[PDB]
Amino acid sequence: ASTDSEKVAEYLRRATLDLRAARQRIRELEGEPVAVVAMACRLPGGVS
Amino acid sequence: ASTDSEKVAEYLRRATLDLRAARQRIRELEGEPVAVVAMACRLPGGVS
């Protein structure tokens, strides 16, 4: 294995992956959208 | 220039700092302690 030529590459890849995962977690925690599933109502008139 | 670990180290340091900052932000978001500053009470038995 070539010293200081390939070893640093793996560490850089791992660090980039971890940073991407952390930023994705932050984005998901802060502003994840929420979906509406069901519907129910009881309004004046004949609405049921 | 010097071998090839003349620029990779800077990128490694930058990535490590960014990862540390992101994890710090996660920790502050999810577990920030809250301090109590003042308190008032009104209880029976003449307590004021």
Epitope: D4, E10, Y11, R13, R14 | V8, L12
Partner: antibody, heavy 118, light 114 residues
Framework: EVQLVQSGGGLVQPGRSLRLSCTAS????????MSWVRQAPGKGLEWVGF??????????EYAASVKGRFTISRDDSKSIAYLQMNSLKTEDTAVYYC?????????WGQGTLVTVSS | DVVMTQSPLSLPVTPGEPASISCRSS???????????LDWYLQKPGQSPQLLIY???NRASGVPDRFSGSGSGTDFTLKISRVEAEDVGVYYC??????????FGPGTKVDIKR
């Protein structure tokens, strides 16, 4: 996601031949370098071989008790790593692992028994 | 180039209180870039090995926050916070100055104190 599976393994008499298949999915297989490790049944973990990447080209180096015994093979069309077996020995009976990375041993495989007896 | 854990090979533990595993080395690593080429690995009973912390103390994703490394270039030591269930197995100290690594090492066992 990133999954690694291993196939090929069973009972073989001394002096036989075999190959092992490591399958990768979920990442660009070209950049990373594959490495094979072996754990004896009741002992520690000992490194076996390590194949470089086509970006640096290169080949493996193997180690003692394995150099000149059997070779490696790596493809790119379907990202399937191959470990050849030549003149298997009884002491070689041990579980085998295929894992990502050449120096930093990242996400691993699942293992295969591969026993040798008569 | 020779590293032995020097930590208690048995190291009985009990949940609640934390623990630590020392890792004494030969001459320090201190690569010119300014890092220590030391890693940690954990092996569960009957499971595939997995990585915990690479160079220094920058534990990768998926690893629970209860783990934390530390140490200088010749006195590495891994700190574990409040102990829980599992985490029983073999822990390995790994160097990176010499590429042709043969054996991971004897490792240190972990088991419940009694």
């Amino acid at each position: 996601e990133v999954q690694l599976v291993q196939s090929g393994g069973g009972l073989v008499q001394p002096g036989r031949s075999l190959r092992l298949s490591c399958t990768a999915s979920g990442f660009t297989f070209g950049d990373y370098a594959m490495s094979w490790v072996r754990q004896a049944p009741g002992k520690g973990l000992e490194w076996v071989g390590f194949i470089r990447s086509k970006a640096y080209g290169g080949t493996t180096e193997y180690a003692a008790s394995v150099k000149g015994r059997f070779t490696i093979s790596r493809d790119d069309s379907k990202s399937i790593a191959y470990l050849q077996m030549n003149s298997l020995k009884t002491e070689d009976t041990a579980v085998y692992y295929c894992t990502r990375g050449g120096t930093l041993f990242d996400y691993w495989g699942q293992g295969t028994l591969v026993t040798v007896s008569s | 180039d020779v590293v032995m854990t020097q930590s208690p090979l048995s190291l009985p533990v009990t949940p609640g209180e934390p623990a630590s595993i020392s890792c004494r080395s030969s001459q320090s690593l201190l690569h010119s870039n300014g890092y220590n080429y030391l890693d940690w690995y954990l092996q569960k009973p009957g499971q595939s090995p997995q990585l915990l912390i690479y160079l220094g103390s920058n534990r990768a994703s998926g690893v629970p926050d209860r783990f934390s490394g530390s140490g200088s270039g010749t006195d590495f030591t891994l700190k574990i916070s409040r102990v829980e269930a599992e985490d029983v197995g073999v822990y390995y100290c790994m160097q990176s100055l010499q590429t042709p690594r043969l054996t991971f090492g004897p490792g240190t066992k972990v088991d419940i104190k009694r």
